[PDB]
Ligand binder design. Structure first.
Ligand SMILES: Cc1cc2nc3c(=O)[nH]c(=O)nc-3n(C[C@H](O)[C@H](O)[C@H](O)COP(=O)(O)OP(=O)(O)OC[C@H]3O[C@@H](n4cnc5c(N)ncnc54)[C@H](O)[C@@H]3O)c2cc1C
Ligand SMILES: Cc1cc2nc3c(=O)[nH]c(=O)nc-3n(C[C@H](O)[C@H](O)[C@H](O)COP(=O)(O)OP(=O)(O)OC[C@H]3O[C@@H](n4cnc5c(N)ncnc54)[C@H](O)[C@@H]3O)c2cc1C
Ligand SMILES: NC(=O)c1ccc[n+]([C@@H]2O[C@H](COP(=O)([O-])OP(=O)(O)OC[C@H]3O[C@@H](n4cnc5c(N)ncnc54)[C@H](O)[C@@H]3O)[C@@H](O)[C@H]2O)c1
Ligand SMILES: NC(=O)c1ccc[n+]([C@@H]2O[C@H](COP(=O)([O-])OP(=O)(O)OC[C@H]3O[C@@H](n4cnc5c(N)ncnc54)[C@H](O)[C@@H]3O)[C@@H](O)[C@H]2O)c1
Ligand SMILES: NC(=O)c1ccc[n+]([C@@H]2O[C@H](COP(=O)([O-])OP(=O)(O)OC[C@H]3O[C@@H](n4cnc5c(N)ncnc54)[C@H](O)[C@@H]3O)[C@@H](O)[C@H]2O)c1
Ligand SMILES: NC(=O)c1ccc[n+]([C@@H]2O[C@H](COP(=O)([O-])OP(=O)(O)OC[C@H]3O[C@@H](n4cnc5c(N)ncnc54)[C@H](O)[C@@H]3O)[C@@H](O)[C@H]2O)c1
Ligand SMILES: [Ca+2]
Ligand SMILES: [Ca+2]
Ligand SMILES: [Ca+2]
Ligand SMILES: [Cl-]
Ligand SMILES: [Cl-]
Ligand SMILES: [Mg+2]
Lengths: 166, 165
């Protein structure tokens, strides 16, 4: 039975936003106090120049970091990394002593070990996005592990792929 | 590990495909209604309620979106690969192979059987390299809770495993 959504109702809006499935990333930065934040707003944008974007809430600490720093990293989380996804979504101590990570050579940001891919990006534009800021980054380098497959987030829940039937 | 040269578009597409997404069909109305398959759909903001899509500068839909006040997004359900392929084909009624309903608010075709329809007003146009980023405000939406979206990952259509919980 179809549910009509009142866009002013944020409970309902979050329900419909949840209808579009995504992967899950952890965005990280270096600097004097490196930080990570779980993000599903990651979107690949352009091939030439190679661009991606993320949308970050204005009240997140990560927002203040990204506005101040020239680069960030994206770690696309693999199917078995729900613990890492939850950890970097916690609002609440080294944030990174729970997880295995390797230093990003271009971003100076911790890259999450076990990820499907790492992308290190230079911040190119900041665009207004309502209660978020849209950060457009140019991909400086990336590394991927072809054997790995991403975790999923849909309907407000973490989910898994069915193995490819072809 | 595979090191990716970002200037190599084959490699770059491989890494872009490592982030799984759903699949939408973006539609517009007007004299010549049009649809295009898009996975760059992203929900952005709660207040105001905003979403974005990234559309190639050379796409025919690109000119529509820069000109028209509204568009619709149909989030495709798990069994809708045929519609995804159809609205991604480059080469004429585009809507004679799908079940669709006119959206009252957008004036654009809404794809039947979808997980959700979102009808949006174009809010901003932002530079996005070889794409334009279209930011839209959600005017109304309808959803079907029992449905689940189709998935696109590694350049292939995929489906969910049953929720363990
Ligand atoms: C699966 C998931 C995806 C998320 N995606 C985003 C996102 O794209 N942008 C964002 O600003 N916050 C996102 N968050 C929220 C963020 O990870 C934190 O949970 C939240 O921001 C609370 O702490 P913080 O603001 O200090 O960071 C996401 C959370 C989860 C669980
Ligand atoms: C699964 C999938 C997702 C796509 N996502 C986008 C997208 O987000 N933006 C885009 O400009 N094109 C996207 N395309 C391509 C688009 O649907 C057409 O295949 C292509 O752009 C050729 O016609 P035209 O849109 O350029 O006109 C996608 C295609 C597929 C198959
Ligand atoms: O598990 P959960 O239900 O506790 O979600 C945790 C937090 O993540 C936030 N969140 C998820 N996606 C977000 C986004 N795109 N932008 C800002 N916050 C987001 C939610 O608001 C929630 O507060
Ligand atoms: O419910 P939820 O946190 O379980 O997630 C449902 C959907 O709402 C989105 N969401 C949650 N909080 C958000 C926020 N503050 N801003 C934008 N999107 C948000 C999530 O990303 C997800 O797409
Ligand atoms: O199946 P497919 O291999 O036939 O892909 C079809 C087309 O979709 C295009 N495509 C996929 N995602 C895109 C995006 N975000 N922007 C522009 N084109 C995209 C590809 O370039 C390809 O030409
Ligand atoms: O290989 P592919 O078409 O099978 O898809 C792989 C990845 O590349 C992306 N992609 C393909 N063509 C693109 C384009 N022209 N611009 C941005 N992203 C594109 C797809 O969306 C997908 O994320
Ligand atoms: Ca209400
Ligand atoms: Ca090459
Ligand atoms: Ca559902
Ligand atoms: Cl809220
Ligand atoms: Cl290409
Ligand atoms: Mg996205």
């Amino acid at each position: 039975p179809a549910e009509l959504v009142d866009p002013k109702d944020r409970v309902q809006l979050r329900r419909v936003f949840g209808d579009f499935p995504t992967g899950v990333t952890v965005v990280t930065v270096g600097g004097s106090e490196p930080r990570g934040m779980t993000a599903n707003s990651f979107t690949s944008v352009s091939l030439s120049p190679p661009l991606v974007l993320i949308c970050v809430g204005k009240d997140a600490v990560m927002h203040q970091r990204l506005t101040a720093l020239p680069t960030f990293a994206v770690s696309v989380l693999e199917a078995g990394q729900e613990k890492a996804a939850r950890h970097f979504a916690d609002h609440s101590v080294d944030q990174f002593d729970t997880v295995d990570w390797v230093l990003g050579e271009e971003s100076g940001a911790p890259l999450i070990a076990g990820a499907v891919a790492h992308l290190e990006c230079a911040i190119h534009r900041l665009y207004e996005g309502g209660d978020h800021t849209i950060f457009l980054g140019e991909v400086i380098t990336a590394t991927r592990w072809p054997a790995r497959e991403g975790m999923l987030f849909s309907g407000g829940r973490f989910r898994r792929f069915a193995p490819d039937a072809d």
